[PDB]
Design a protein around this ligand. Structure first.
Ligand SMILES: CCCCCCCC/C=C\CCCCCCCC(=O)O[C@@H](COC(=O)CCCCCCCCCCCCCCC)COP(=O)([O-])OCC[N+](C)(C)C
Ligand SMILES: CCCCCCCC/C=C\CCCCCCCC(=O)O[C@@H](COC(=O)CCCCCCCCCCCCCCC)COP(=O)([O-])OCC[N+](C)(C)C
Ligand SMILES: CCCCCCCC/C=C\CCCCCCCC(=O)O[C@@H](COC(=O)CCCCCCCCCCCCCCC)COP(=O)([O-])OCC[N+](C)(C)C
Ligand SMILES: CCCCCCCC/C=C\CCCCCCCC(=O)O[C@@H](COC(=O)CCCCCCCCCCCCCCC)COP(=O)([O-])OCC[N+](C)(C)C
Ligand SMILES: CCCCCCCC/C=C\CCCCCCCC(=O)O[C@@H](COC(=O)CCCCCCCCCCCCCCC)COP(=O)([O-])OCC[N+](C)(C)C
Ligand SMILES: CCCCCCCC/C=C\CCCCCCCC(=O)O[C@@H](COC(=O)CCCCCCCCCCCCCCC)COP(=O)([O-])OCC[N+](C)(C)C
Ligand SMILES: CCCCCCCC/C=C\CCCCCCCC(=O)O[C@@H](COC(=O)CCCCCCCCCCCCCCC)COP(=O)([O-])OCC[N+](C)(C)C
Ligand SMILES: CCCCCCCC/C=C\CCCCCCCC(=O)O[C@@H](COC(=O)CCCCCCCCCCCCCCC)COP(=O)([O-])OCC[N+](C)(C)C
Ligand SMILES: CCCCCCCC/C=C/CCCCCCCC(=O)OC[C@H](O)CO
Ligand SMILES: CCCCCCCC/C=C/CCCCCCCC(=O)OC[C@H](O)CO
Ligand SMILES: CCCCCCCC/C=C\CCCCCCCC(=O)OC[C@H](O)CO
Ligand SMILES: CCCCCCCC/C=C\CCCCCCCC(=O)OC[C@H](O)CO
Ligand SMILES: CCCCCCCCCCCCCCCC(=O)O
Ligand SMILES: CCCCCCCCCCCCCCCC(=O)O
Ligand SMILES: CCCCCCCCCCCCCCCC(=O)O
Ligand SMILES: CCCCCCCCCCCCCCCC(=O)O
Lengths: 137, 176, 142, 139, 137, 176, 176, 176
């Protein structure tokens, strides 16, 4: 069949994606909570940014310093490593069993990520305009 | 914005509790093809399964949750719905703390404990969802009861964040 | 038949001995990084707790808030980076192998049952973190 | 089948590579725009935006991260895009190396020679640009 | 056959490994050179640390700021991404065509990385002692 | 570089608009085997497909875009080619703002508006390309019309950056 | 915590040494099927293999390590078990340094030496384990002797850290 | 340490040049099984192949080389040994600059240019190695000529870094 727009999600079941989102929220909220009632800048917005960047195995501008922050961060790092490796491994499986049955990936079976990307850029520009107008008045 | 913060906290606490209690009560978690006692389209919940069509339609039977330590523990935990119920309990206690805050403004920790209850309720909710889905695995769709549980989780986490902000700002303002 | 997925089946690509030696290597690296960073009396941020955090983050490929500046610290860091790269690639590669060829070819999406263990460890860690935060609070408030 | 100098591009179609380049430019420009015209603040000029985006795609992290909501949305979707695309590259390369269209060989220098040539070309270009910058700034 | 101690190098040919080492040196030296004769702390040792960390996709304490430094860094990043992906992909190939001819990998076919690790720790301790004695006298 | 910046902006605005309009008009996007009525080599644009060798050489015919809701939406969007046209519209408005900025020196935002329009044109352009490619493949080569679209995107983004720089410099010099 | 630090160091030094010495002495590293002379269940250490059920129950025999230069070196290193023995030696020297440090308060480096010895013992221990595992597999289970080795490693590393902390605190207080 | 730095620079320049020139001259790059004109063990270089045993032993021919734009260019570049020779040339010029430095201390850029030549020589060396190996691909082992080339690369890079450090320290010292 012709690949579907969001076919890049296929390696993991819908329930895994949904639970990833919930785990993301739970981690961000607990990191925020343990950081503000701890002896020794993880507000909620920065907690969400830390967690997002951790899941994408990207940069962190800040890492937790407390023991509780570091426990939260450490388990989220471990979860991320398993889940991303699982995505890659299962995608390799789907593509190897399809080749057994050029096989270069076509724009069509990653088109959804491009649409989400450009949608995000559009949304970002809109939010920038809104925030700017709000700060103007 | 303390008035609006408390308004959001109270409304959200009530919303989370209502959604989670309805979800635990109602029987539209899963649309599958089982039997109320031939297989037909059903609609199961946490406790009962019911027929969606045909002669026995509207007839519901208690789910035989039961028919390997791990399988046994999963089946036990899913049978009793420990975690959905625990999340309902914690939302109730969080609501009690939020209500009690206004009638006792001397002590600060009341609203903080509200926040902590809500956060814990969300965590229990997550464990419940995972256990439920995993136990089912051992075609189909999810009903509106399932999504009521999910929305309860989201709202609970939001209300927890707002409660902790109330406590933080009280201690920040008073201390300086 | 197809063995129903176990909790902790996410550990299956590597033998139990590899996992236990990863944990020992982790401790050894953290302690040596601490040692070669400290006893040098020229300088004395790589205490033991920060050493453990640096090492953990290196293994999870999450990078760092601090990097070693000495030659000894950098040697330790460099070999731990190389070890990490080989081990994680090995995990991914062997998991791909297991998912492609059944050895008790349709290939199905991973189900929540295949990764449920990692979710339980995660939520366990969040619970533990909250408990530790309470304990720290009570200790430091008295 | 002689590998071919630029055979390392084979896992992804030519259209994906060209759209990656366009997405890269678009992301860099929008990150610059939503970071600047906000007159409340005005480090994410255009050159730094391009560097942030490049490092994000190569999974090399950053010296600077966005702090605004708009910058973080842009960064977040670019991070997600990067993750999917790179996993797709690795997965499809695993497919081609597993099934020929049965033993598996170690990759030979011929299979990755193009990447070496691009590398050494970049080093040469960098040295040339350094000389040019030096001569410009010294007069 | 029983796996060899350095069997973890098998996915890439010996010539690739040797050229990776040479490319590493060449990159580090050019980064150092373009950074010291550029208008606008990459001395030779920091250049060699930046490059090593880039190849291991383990981030950095410092990134180049000049155009020439960023060109060098960019091509080294690209090279790294292709080479690491190639390693993982070919290892997946070797392990799949074996399973098609214990599931889990054994300590024996990663034993060499453990030996290199502990060797490096020993060497690090030795260098620390040497540097300490040198700075003492 | 103020004068030079404005010159680059104006020339670039015109160049981007011209390239994109030509691309949307001309019929050399794709080189493929088909029939404009055995199938011969042809060339297609967004609207017409035309044979370039044979008895019917130089003949053209409207593409039948409509010979799976996602497939339907893709077919719709690619049939209207809303995105290339929207890119041309936004380039037109950006050029108009650049022209107007020369008059209303009092209001800075005019040139900023130009900037934003150009940036947005670039985004719509990229969507266009993806949709186009995604719909076609659902051998061949790309003609000069396609590459005119691509170069339009690049120039549009460059001009957007330069325009925003002009506005930034205005609001910086004003503060000085 | 100075007194407590030294108490932990001394107790830990003794514990690590005792555990590692017992582990190297006792014969419950591996549980596997073999013959100490049909093959019965047995238990092996570093040197002796002994049957634990059958006619010859309680019988023991020297392992034949030597029944491919890398294979030869592995066999040699695992036959001598140089690394577990070296770990015991270094733990002994570390303990001796800890005892001596109580006397020569003038020379700080004594306790630092203790630290280093313990750390080094840990490394040799890990090499031992890897060599052991690598050689064996070239079903089964691990006995309490193996886990004594493992716990020795952990305690050795902890005591090394504490010793280095003592030395650091000495050179810090001295500077004050 | 300027005296020692200059000593290292001169000795290293000579060593790199000697090693690279020998490598480009000698004929022990590759041990394979070809023919000097049955296949026997040979020992090829950049220009000639020779028999290592049997009757025709000591007899050397000329590598055919020439016996698909990419394949053509690779074969051309490998046939002429452009890059090894270019690396020899650049090492020669670097040595000339290093020698000329002392006889003309007024101008600084001389040693800097020495360093740049050496760095460039190393890069050419790398390209040569890659081209050589890749061209061979289109059992075997590498001889001592190959490793002479490799060591020339390493030394060239180390001399380049020392030369640049001489220049940097001269400008740092004089400027301040
Ligand atoms: C992906 C989802 C992205 C969601 C959107 C991200 C922005 C929301 C956080 C910003 C925010 O409001 O912080 C404010 C608190 O205000 C709050 O209490 C916000 C409500 C908490 C949201 C928790 C998410 C569940 C102020 O705190 P600060 O963010 O530290 O500034
Ligand atoms: C860093 C802190 C991380 C902390 C982590 C905390 C400690 C681990 C927590 C999870 C234990 C799960 C467990 O034993 O699962 C059993 C199955 O269990 C089920 O199927 C249970 C289903 C209900 C989930 C609760 C199986 O257990 P087993 O037989 O040992 O395999
Ligand atoms: C395992 C995972 C996580 C556990 C890590 C948590 C403990 C962190 C170190 C505790 C510590 O510093 O206490 C003291 C010693 O502490 C020790 O001696 C304990 C460390 C033993 C080595 C670990 C190996 C075995 C782990 C099984 C020293 O106190 P400090 O000098 O303050 O040290 C820096 C701490 N600071 C950054 C808070 C200032
Ligand atoms: C592609 C890869 C690399 C190319 C990147 C090199 C150019 C870097 C920006 C140049 C620049 O800043 O010049 C001016 C505008 O510059 C422009 O308008 C040009 C940028 C066009 C956008 C790129 C899209 C097309 C690329 C095809 C502005 O000067 P500035 O305000 O100084 O900007 C910050 C520069 N600083 C950090 C040096 C201070
Ligand atoms: C970011 C900086 C990038 C810097 C980029 C710098 C430039 C890198 C250019 C590499 C071109 C290689 C080339 O054309 O190879 C040909 C084969 O070529 C050979 O076999 C040539 C062997 C000698 C290598 C020189 C094939 O060429 P093609 O048919 O076009 O494929
Ligand atoms: C692993 C090696 C790590 C150490 C190498 C860097 C040492 C730098 C050094 O000694 O400091 C000095 C340079 O001294 C020099 O001139 C060093 C010359 C060696 C360059 C290595 C070339 C490439 C590898 C073969 C000062 O330079 P720095 O980098 O500011 O320190
Ligand atoms: C700067 C940082 C790095 C610093 C240095 C790190 C490098 C350390 C060197 C590694 C030594 C391992 C070793 O000798 O391997 C031996 C086995 O080895 C054994 O069987 C046991 C050896 C354990 C001791 C390892 C040292 C700690 C075999 O070695 P080999 O003779 O080469 O065998 C050929 C390999 N083959 C089997 C794949 C064909
Ligand atoms: C944080 C910010 C990030 C947010 C970001 C969200 C941004 C919006 C995402 C756009 C979704 C596009 C869409 O609905 O796809 C449609 C076609 O789509 C087309 O044919 C392409 C039309 C252009 C869409 C450009 C959007 C910008 C079809 O998709 P579907 O109807 O869902 O089909 C069911 C699933 N299926 C595709 C597997 C069959
Ligand atoms: C410095 C602060 C660090 C604190 C944060 C570090 C967290 C990182 C690691 C988490 C995984 C740990 C748990 C690993 C799971 C063990 C599961 C297990 O043992 O399973 C037994 C097996 O399944 C029998 O059949
Ligand atoms: C801001 C500073 C950034 C500057 C540094 C960024 C470097 C990153 C990218 C390098 C790869 C670029 C070259 C990609 C290789 C193209 C090869 C090609 O087009 O091949 C044609 C094909 O093989 C026909 O058959
Ligand atoms: C910047 C300061 C310097 C940083 C510090 C340096 C750390 C290097 C880390 C990892 C690479 C080294 C590990 C790889 C060693 C190779 C092992 C090997 O060669 O084994 C194969 C053997 O030849 C059989 O064929
Ligand atoms: C504090 C941080 C601020 C947050 C910054 C925002 C960036 C979040 C990043 C990426 C996720 C977006 C990608 C996921 C898009 C969801 C749509 C999707 O996958 O569609 C599937 C479709 O429903 C078929 O069934
Ligand atoms: C930090 C964690 C957040 C990561 C964001 C990843 C994006 C998740 C998208 C999940 C959407 C769920 C829809 C499932 C797809 C389907 O079944 O068709
Ligand atoms: C650097 C630390 C990374 C985290 C490593 C996780 C350790 C997992 C648990 C190790 C114990 C043994 C687990 C394997 C048991 C089995 O299933 O056979
Ligand atoms: C974010 C930038 C990452 C670098 C991306 C590399 C781009 C490679 C070159 C793109 C042009 C087309 C290459 C494919 C040609 C082909 O072989 O068909
Ligand atoms: C930053 C780049 C450096 C990365 C270090 C990776 C280690 C390279 C090791 C190469 C050794 C060459 C031996 C090849 C193995 C063999 O053929 O048996």
């Amino acid at each position: 069949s012709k690949p579907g727009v969001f076919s890049f999600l296929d390696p993991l079941a819908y329930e895994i994606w949904m639970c990833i989102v919930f785990a993301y929220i739970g981690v961000s909220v607990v990191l925020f909570l343990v950081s503000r009632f701890s002896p020794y800048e993880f507000g909620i917005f920065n907690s969400l940014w830390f967690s997002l960047g951790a899941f994408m195995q990207q940069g962190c501008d800040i890492s937790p310093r407390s023991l509780s922050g570091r426990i939260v961060g450490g388990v989220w790092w471990f979860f991320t490593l398993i889940i991303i490796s699982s995505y890659t491994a299962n995608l390799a499986a789907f593509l190897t069993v399809e080749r057994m049955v050029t096989s270069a990936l076509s724009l069509s079976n990653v088109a959804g990520v491009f649409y989400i990307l450009i949608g995000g850029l559009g949304l970002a520009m809109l939010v920038a305009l809104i925030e700017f107008c709000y700060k103007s008045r | 914005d303390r008035g609006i913060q408390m308004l959001i906290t109270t409304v959200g606490a009530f919303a989370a509790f209502s959604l989670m209690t309805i979800a635990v009560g109602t029987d539209y978690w899963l649309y599958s093809r089982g039997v109320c006692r031939e297989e037909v389209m059903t609609h199961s919940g946490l406790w009962r399964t019911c027929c969606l069509e045909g002669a026995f339609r509207g007839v519901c039977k208690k789910i035989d949750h039961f028919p390997d330590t791990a399988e046994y523990l999963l089946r036990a935990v899913r049978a009793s719905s420990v975690f959905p119920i625990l999340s309902v309990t914690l939302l109730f206690f969080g609501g009690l703390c939020v209500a009690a805050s206004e009638f006792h403004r001397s002590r600060h920790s009341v609203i903080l404990s509200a926040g902590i209850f809500f956060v814990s309720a969300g965590l229990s909710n997550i464990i419940g969802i995972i256990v439920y889905i995993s136990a089912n695995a051992g075609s189909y769709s999810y009903g509106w009861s399932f999504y009521f549980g999910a929305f309860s989780f989201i709202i609970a986490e939001i209300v927890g964040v707002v409660a902790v902000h109330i406590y933080i700002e009280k201690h920040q303002q008073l201390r300086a």
